[PDB]
A paper describes a structure:
Because of the difficulty we encountered in obtaining the CNTN4–APPb crystals, we followed the strategy we employed for chicken CNTN3–APP crystals and generated a fusion protein between the FN1–FN2 region of zebrafish CNTN4 and the E1 domain of zebrafish APLP2. The structure of this chimeric protein was refined to 2.46 Å (Rwork/Rfree = 0.189/0.221). Overall, the CNTN4–APPb and CNTN4–APLP2 interfaces display many of the same features found in the cocrystals of chicken CNTN4 and APP. As is the case in previous CNTN–APP complex structures, the bulk of the interactions includes main chain–main chain hydrogen bonds between two β-strands: W751–Q753 in CNTN4 and L129–P132 in APPb or L134–P137 in APLP2. As is the case in the CNTN3–APP and CNTN4–APP interfaces, the carbonyl oxygen atom of S126 in APPb (S131 in APLP2) forms a hydrogen bond with the hydroxyl group of Y764. Furthermore, CNTN4 residues Y784 and E789 form hydrogen bonds with E141 and H139, respectively, in APPb, and with E146 and H144, respectively, in APLP2. Overall, the sum of this crystallographic work indicates that the CNTN4–APLP2 interface in zebrafish is essentially identical to the CNTN4–APPb interface in zebrafish and the CNTN4–APP interface in chicken. Finally, in APLP2, the alanine residue is replaced by a bulkier Cβ-branched valine, and the side chain of M752 appears to swing away from V133.
Author numbering: 597 to 745, 748 to 802, 1036 to 1199
Write the structure that this text describes.
Amino acid sequence: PGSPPGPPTSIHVEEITDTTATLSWRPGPDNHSPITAYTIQARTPFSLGWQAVSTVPEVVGGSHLTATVIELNPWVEYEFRVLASNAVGTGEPSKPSKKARTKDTVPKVTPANVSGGGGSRSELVITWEPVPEELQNGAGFGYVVAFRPSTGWMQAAVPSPEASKYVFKNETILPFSPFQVKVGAYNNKGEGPFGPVITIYSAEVAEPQVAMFCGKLNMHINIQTGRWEPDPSGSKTCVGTKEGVLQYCQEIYPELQITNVVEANQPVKIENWCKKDKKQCKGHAHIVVPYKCLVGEFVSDVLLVPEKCKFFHKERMDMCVSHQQWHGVAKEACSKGNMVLHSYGMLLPCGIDKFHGTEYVCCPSTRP
């Protein structure tokens, strides 16, 4: 006989971490039997309704208006409700707390069903099963692909949670040649583990670039010859905006679909610059950083990682910054490791010559 307690009210989230959540609550009516224990329940989009959770203390006594839930899933939206129990029974569940997501850590699972094969001429196709949302454990989720025909790994960061494929197109890929491949995941907090190395097979002259020097006709690369040639209209000199560089690319290579531009990572000595509006041109050499004309969908560069070296990548969704800035980030990130910047590439375009991240390789310095 008698009556169970009432439902508690005012479920607060006092503090929340990657696996824990501290809760406070107002005691409901006990109906004249002292409350003996409080129990907590939690609901997520992946929890099959409401489920019981563990706490520290293991049992929450009736004189406690606060406890901490443990063993929660990182990067998952949570809501909690408290139940009041006495010698008669267990009262009705409380109204849920305001939804709050647990904080993040590095992913712990590896991408499933890594595989590959097929594709078009001189391609290597790598595939995997995207990591489900509940197992991503954080924002900025992506994948790192590692493959090799050799001891150096070839690696690229693929910054898209739902990406399931990576296609390496390079003319040095032999047809139907064996490749070892492993894939791992990452997020804002760091790297996940790589999965097992498996074997896949591949499928059965110069890059478009423009260069500028104010007062002189723009130069561009001849894709076939590989030689630098002047502006075909004989009138266009340096442009004022990065979008202007993109437009000049599209004018110079009409057979291509130009979608972005980015500074080349190294300067090049270009011969035979000609002054604008000069009927006769005494050629001159100039060392400039040219702009690569990027085509089609953006694909992260593949970076060779010699076995002495290490592959890193950083991205941030809160800032969209330039190629020169990411270069300084990668370069300093490796002097702070007492190493040298070997190579680097842009991740995640967010504007014309502006990116959300960079990948880079760092090596010990070569000296006697």
